[PDB]
């Protein structure tokens, strides 16, 4: 865990945010609010347990507790909800903006120091462990608070103060026809870990394209599967963390709730004497398995100890070259092992030495693995995956041992096999050409389950109670027309090459 | 789908592939960069000697192959026994 995330959005309640160079372009307030909607939807599906708030500045009215003028808070730091989405969308649009300007003011003098006070106080309100005091704001101009030198000085003083307090903030470039005026008033006063300010950005060219994009995932935090241990012989033991860099996600379980109250009704379940109508007890339980006629009775710890073979841990078997593993031999999704000094101190040194040595030897680690108590231990192989970096020196692959599992004899399922049949080499060349026609470079993040996407689409659609639900796009459908036009007549050429001209492959 | 060729037959193998959701990325510091945990050379040599003692394959003479000293893929699951 080690902290949580929270963002607060700041919108200039002025008239510059309520115009457009051309009607094809929305107002700054318009694309800001729609990007806010997209961000909130993403947070709900991704990390709904975070904190989000909305505050406005420059408006005529105000709502902050300290009651600084022009400082109207809209929403406080809370887990996002569809109600907030509705509150935002009631003013999102070419007329909802007018509704907002009617029921709410816009355009007045203020001090950025005041909004910084308000946001700092809002930070003070939250109490859970917190890690990312990210602040987001939206405008296309900087100099209005540089107009008053005293206002500029106090604003930059408070900005330095909040930077000292660990607060991090980010601004979106908005389309100002005369240029946002980078480097004039903000990047010297705002918090940046890097400098790319080169163009005063007459347009809104910054990272809205990423933010408006909707993501659909869960992004489970880095949680150690176990600090399980490797028993070398009987006493040489090291502490290593267990991880799964891939973990099959699935649709969240439903919650059974009422009809007219919609309340999730608790469901107590028990067992009673059917022959009597009385009541039975968990102690009054006996499991049976009848093979033919004889009935055999087993109990709780009776069924437990049959699963008992050894203590949960890793028991080294030996070493074998990596090549001696058949690729088609697969059991289930692989695991990953990372060292740790939390329990066994110096175990990281041993892990590094083993990784380097076995990488030199090109050998695999054979070991007996017991996940937890009362489980049959299974043999596994630890292939050393070296940490690989990129042009950005980011870990495209972390260091450690990828944990692949070794199937047993029962796993092997033989099938009715046939003889070996060969093919003419010219047909093989035709296949090579046809493959080259439709070849491409695979990338892992280029594909996704459309079924869960459609599930989400429906979920937020009924949440947003529109006329129609959003339609997900299947990225797993082949481009049949594109592939066919890309191949040409080679398809039918090989069809007559191999398949009989009179007999189609269809029966 | 990838091929699998035997002496008597050849066939393709299907392995289900994950989507973007199934994947997850976490930070993992390299130990070699952490010089506080750099093994000594003598320790490395002892490790290599143990590795040689842990070689569960034998380089066969008169036919250069690595025979398996412990084939587990042809071993049943003792839980049922």
């Amino acid at each position: 865990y080690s902290g949580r995330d929270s963002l607060i959005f700041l919108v200039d309640a002025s008239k510059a945010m309520f115009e457009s160079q051309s009607e094809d372009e929305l107002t700054p307030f318009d694309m800001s609010i729609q990007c806010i909607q997209s961000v909130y939807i993403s947070k709900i599906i991704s990390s709904d347990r975070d904190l989000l708030a909305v505050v406005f500045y420059g408006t005529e009215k105000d709502k902050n507790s300290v009651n600084f003028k022009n400082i109207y808070v809209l929403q406080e730091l809370d887990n996002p909800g569809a109600k907030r989405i509705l509150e935002l969308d009631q003013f999102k649009g070419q007329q909802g903006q007018k509704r907002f300007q009617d029921m709410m003011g816009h355009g007045s003098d203020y001090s950025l120091s005041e909004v910084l006070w308000v946001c700092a106080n809002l930070f003070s309100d939250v109490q859970f462990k917190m890690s990312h005091k990210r602040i987001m704001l939206f405008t296309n101009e900087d100099n209005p608070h540089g107009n008053d030198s005293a206002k500029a000085s106090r604003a930059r003083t408070k900005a330095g103060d909040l930077r000292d307090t660990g607060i991090f903030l980010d601004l979106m470039h908005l389309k100002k026809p005369g240029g946002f005026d980078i480097s004039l008033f903000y990047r010297d006063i705002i918090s940046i870990a890097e400098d790319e300010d080169l163009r005063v950005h007459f347009e809104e060219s910054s990272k809205l394209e990423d933010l408006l994009r909707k993501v659909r995932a869960k992004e489970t935090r880095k949680r150690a599967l176990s600090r399980l241990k490797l028993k070398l012989n009987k006493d040489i033991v090291i502490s290593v963390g267990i991880y799964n860099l891939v973990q099959k996600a699935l649709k969240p379980p439903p919650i059974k709730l009422y009809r007219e109250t919609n309340e999730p009704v608790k469901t107590k379940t028990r067992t009673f004497n059917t022959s009597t109508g009385g009541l039975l007890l968990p102690s009054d339980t006996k499991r049976s398995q009848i093979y033919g006629s004889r009935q055999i009775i087993l109990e709780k710890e009776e069924t437990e100890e049959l699963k008992r073979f050894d203590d949960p841990g890793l028991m080294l078997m030996g070493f074998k070259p990596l090549v001696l593993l058949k690729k088609h031999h697969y059991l289930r999704p692989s695991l990953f092992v990372y060292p740790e000094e939390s329990l066994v101190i110096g175990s990281s040194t041993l892990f590094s030495a083993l990784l380097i040595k076995c990488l030199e030897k090109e050998v695999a680690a054979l070991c007996r693995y017991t996940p937890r108590r009362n489980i049959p231990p299974y043999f596994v192989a630890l292939v050393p995956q070296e940490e690989e970096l990129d042009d950005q020196k980011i870990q495209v692959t972390p260091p450690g041992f990828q944990l692949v599992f070794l199937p047993f004899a029962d796993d092997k399922r033989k099938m009715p096999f046939t003889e070996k049949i060969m093919a003419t080499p010219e047909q093989v060349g035709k296949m090579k050409a046809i493959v080259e026609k439709l070849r491409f470079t695979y990338r892992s993040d280029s594909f996704e389950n459309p079924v869960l996407q459609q599930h989400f689409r429906n979920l937020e659609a009924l949440a947003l109670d529109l006329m129609e639900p959003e339609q997900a796009v299947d990225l797993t459908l082949p481009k049949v027309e594109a592939m066919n036009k890309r191949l040409g007549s080679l398809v039918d050429e090989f069809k007559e090459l191999v398949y009989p001209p009179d007999y189609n492959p269809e029966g | 789908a990838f091929p699998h060729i035997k002496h008597n037959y050849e066939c393709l193998v299907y392995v289900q592939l994950p989507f973007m959701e199934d994947l997850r990325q976490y930070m993992f510091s390299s130990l070699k960069n952490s010089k506080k945990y750099a093994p000594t050379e003598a320790q490395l040599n002892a490790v290599d000697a143990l590795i040689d003692s842990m070689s569960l394959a034998k380089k066969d003479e008169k036919t250069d192959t690595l025979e398996d000293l412990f084939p587990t893929t042809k071993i049943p699951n003792p839980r049922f026994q």
């Binding site: 961000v39 993403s42 991704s46 990390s47 990423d210 992004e219 990338r443 280029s446 | -």
Partner: peptide, 23 residues
């Protein structure tokens, strides 16, 4: 941090859908 999803801290910024090109 470069190569990081701003919307989702501490995580890779996914590349959008690309499909396949013809060369």
């Amino acid at each position: 941090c470069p190569g990081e999803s701003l919307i989702n801290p501490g995580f890779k910024s996914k590349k959008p859908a690309g499909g396949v090109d013809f060369d």
